[PDB]
Amino acid sequence: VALEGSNLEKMIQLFLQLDRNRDDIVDENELRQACAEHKLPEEEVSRWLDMFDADENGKITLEEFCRALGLRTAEMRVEKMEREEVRAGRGRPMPEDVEVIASTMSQEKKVEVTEKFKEFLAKTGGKPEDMNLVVKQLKDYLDERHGRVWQTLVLTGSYWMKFSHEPFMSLQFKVGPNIVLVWRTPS
Amino acid sequence: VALEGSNLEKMIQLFLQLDRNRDDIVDENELRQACAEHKLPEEEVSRWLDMFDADENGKITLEEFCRALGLRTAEMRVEKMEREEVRAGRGRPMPEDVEVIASTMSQEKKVEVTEKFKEFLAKTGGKPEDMNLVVKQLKDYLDERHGRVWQTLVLTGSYWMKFSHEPFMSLQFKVGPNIVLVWRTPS
């Protein structure tokens, strides 16, 4: 069923769907064909394929794929399973009063981030002077548990945003009057 | 005139001010002296200064400095020129109605960015259905003319932010009811 995100994220999702835990190896041609059948630009995919060092059989290991794209293989193993989980029917609710605006995160990670924001907010009382502390605590949690470096914002009122982030690392949500925007970038 | 920004940004500004020869050569002892005069902490300066492969003649070239620090050499050449203009009393005024909240951008880039936001906004009518297009135009302009990748936000209301940006590449400003946040992250 449906597949979502930027072109690079869709290629990564398709690689993870073809990948099998037993060997973590994906056929280059099968990856290209799946990208074609999901309408990705031909030039872009061919340019990505040239970045991957395939073996003599034309197979890309998950490690080589992540290395070439600046991804963390251990993290992509977890993403693979957390996405399979929801496709298999084992989805979870979001925590109470969480409204997701947009996201590229796996569902488990969405629960993790929104529950930590609610926990940090509950300890400070949610006044504007306490919001700097909440933002710093949420950024610290994200930087440590999910790698550096995270852009972290809380705002009230209306907003419009065009932004760039590492694959699957972005989430925009609302709890009451607070809008929370988090995403990861390199370094 | 006064240094601004992070310790790393201040050390880079000092490097560019010291670089006053045709070969882009800076004397490492002179750089340390400037950092000491500007009360930059020794622990951080020493960590950065060890990232450079000084020639054993105690000299660092702009190119070596930029490579060790993850800066684009051509951008730093232009940054030096723009900052010196301001030091010389020859900077541009900010355009009408622009209130700068925080920035480590050079003055000429601050003028260009806030000017471009006003022009993109003036060609739409300023309505909320049109602001997604304003933000997209600004981000695309910045990505192309000043390198990838730019984060771009327009907001009405209040905000709290912890974020990370490349040296000199961040600007927050207000024009009328709109607060505009822009900054660049790697890649």
Side-chain angles (χ1 to χ4, degrees):
Chain A
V1 68
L3 290 178
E4 327 209 78
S6 85
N7 286 326
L8 162 67
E9 285 172 328
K10 191 134 55 143
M11 167 168 86
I12 296 167
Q13 298 204 285
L14 295 160
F15 187 100
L16 294 181
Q17 285 169 181
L18 289 163
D19 180 289
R20 270 313 316 131
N21 295 327
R22 50 177 92 111
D23 43 9
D24 285 323
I25 220 167
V26 170
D27 188 276
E28 220 171 29
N29 283 322
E30 172 131 37
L31 185 57
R32 178 162 192 251
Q33 156 204 21
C35 290
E37 310 148 309
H38 285 76
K39 299 291 188 215
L40 281 71
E42 196 136 344
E43 329 76 50
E44 208 152 41
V45 168
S46 262
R47 203 90 209 110
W48 280 318
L49 281 204
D50 293 346
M51 294 182 80
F52 308 133
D53 283 343
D55 60 30
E56 338 185 305
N57 302 324
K59 317 263 181 283
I60 308 323
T61 65
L62 177 70
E63 166 83 7
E64 168 58 17
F65 186 72
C66 299
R67 181 215 61 99
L69 292 176
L71 315 162
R72 309 139 181 263
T73 86
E75 185 172 66
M76 299 286 123
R77 298 193 209 110
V78 172
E79 290 284 333
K80 179 188 196 286
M81 146 201 102
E82 298 184 336
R83 314 228 166 208
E84 273 155 11
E85 178 100 338
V86 182
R87 294 197 93 84
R90 311 195 258 289
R92 290 286 203 319
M94 270 324 101
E96 211 196 315
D97 299 334
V98 166
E99 311 146 62
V100 172
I101 300 161
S103 192
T104 59
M105 299 206 171
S106 75
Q107 192 183 74
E108 174 46 41
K109 299 211 154 80
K110 285 205 273 163
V111 174
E112 272 168 30
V113 179
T114 58
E115 80 190 358
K116 276 277 175 321
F117 166 83
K118 287 190 45 191
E119 162 182 351
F120 293 148
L121 189 69
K123 301 214 164 323
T124 78
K127 296 311 280 133
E129 66 259 29
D130 317 299
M131 198 63 53
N132 279 311
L133 179 60
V134 178
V135 171
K136 177 246 173 203
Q137 289 178 295
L138 186 59
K139 166 148 163 66
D140 283 351
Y141 163 76
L142 290 162
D143 277 344
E144 287 175 332
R145 192 78 75 255
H146 298 286
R148 312 185 110 270
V149 63
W150 286 84
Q151 321 287 342
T152 294
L153 280 99
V154 176
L155 58 90
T156 55
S158 292
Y159 79 109
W160 302 266
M161 176 178 62
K162 253 49 153 134
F163 73 127
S164 296
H165 55 84
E166 291 191 339
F168 312 137
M169 306 294 162
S170 74
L171 168 60
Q172 310 172 51
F173 63 103
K174 186 147 166 309
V175 178
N178 296 319
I179 284 132
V180 187
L181 319 172
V182 296
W183 66 100
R184 195 177 73 196
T185 57
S187 268
Chain B
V1 77
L3 305 182
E4 55 178 20
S6 76
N7 290 328
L8 168 71
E9 284 172 319
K10 293 197 261 184
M11 168 180 93
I12 300 167
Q13 285 147 29
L14 289 176
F15 186 99
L16 299 178
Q17 301 196 354
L18 287 173
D19 172 11
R20 317 194 77 84
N21 53 95
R22 160 171 324 267
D23 293 304
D24 284 311
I25 293 167
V26 167
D27 183 70
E28 183 167 349
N29 290 334
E30 276 188 1
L31 185 52
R32 283 195 275 272
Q33 181 196 336
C35 292
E37 296 171 337
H38 282 92
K39 316 190 109 193
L40 296 197
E42 169 283 309
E43 169 101 314
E44 294 185 45
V45 171
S46 279
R47 159 154 137 270
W48 292 305
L49 283 210
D50 272 40
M51 305 180 184
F52 319 138
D53 334 333
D55 54 357
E56 230 173 39
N57 232 355
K59 309 302 188 170
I60 308 153
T61 67
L62 177 71
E63 163 71 12
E64 286 160 349
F65 189 72
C66 290
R67 185 183 55 250
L69 287 181
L71 319 166
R72 309 173 187 217
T73 306
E75 260 187 356
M76 288 309 105
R77 292 190 224 109
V78 171
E79 288 282 336
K80 186 219 193 300
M81 276 183 236
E82 303 186 331
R83 315 225 164 215
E84 295 301 347
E85 284 202 305
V86 167
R87 290 168 83 289
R90 311 182 35 203
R92 287 285 187 316
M94 212 73 39
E96 249 175 29
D97 305 308
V98 171
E99 321 169 42
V100 174
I101 293 162
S103 186
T104 54
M105 209 150 285
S106 75
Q107 181 78 7
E108 158 73 28
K109 271 158 207 217
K110 285 195 272 175
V111 171
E112 167 183 15
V113 173
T114 60
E115 265 203 330
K116 280 282 166 327
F117 165 80
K118 294 178 70 199
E119 318 187 323
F120 292 144
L121 189 66
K123 267 288 132 152
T124 85
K127 266 162 299 272
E129 327 87 15
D130 297 314
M131 272 266 211
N132 276 315
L133 158 83
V134 176
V135 181
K136 171 186 166 42
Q137 270 144 32
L138 186 64
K139 163 160 168 68
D140 285 355
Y141 180 83
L142 294 170
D143 279 345
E144 283 196 358
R145 300 300 109 88
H146 297 289
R148 280 175 57 81
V149 88
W150 286 84
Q151 324 289 347
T152 304
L153 281 98
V154 171
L155 60 93
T156 56
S158 294
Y159 70 102
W160 309 256
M161 196 187 7
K162 316 250 146 203
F163 71 124
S164 153
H165 62 81
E166 298 182 272
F168 310 149
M169 298 317 156
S170 76
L171 161 62
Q172 291 168 48
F173 66 97
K174 178 180 173 94
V175 175
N178 294 313
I179 276 169
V180 180
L181 322 171
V182 300
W183 67 105
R184 196 183 79 193
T185 51
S187 209

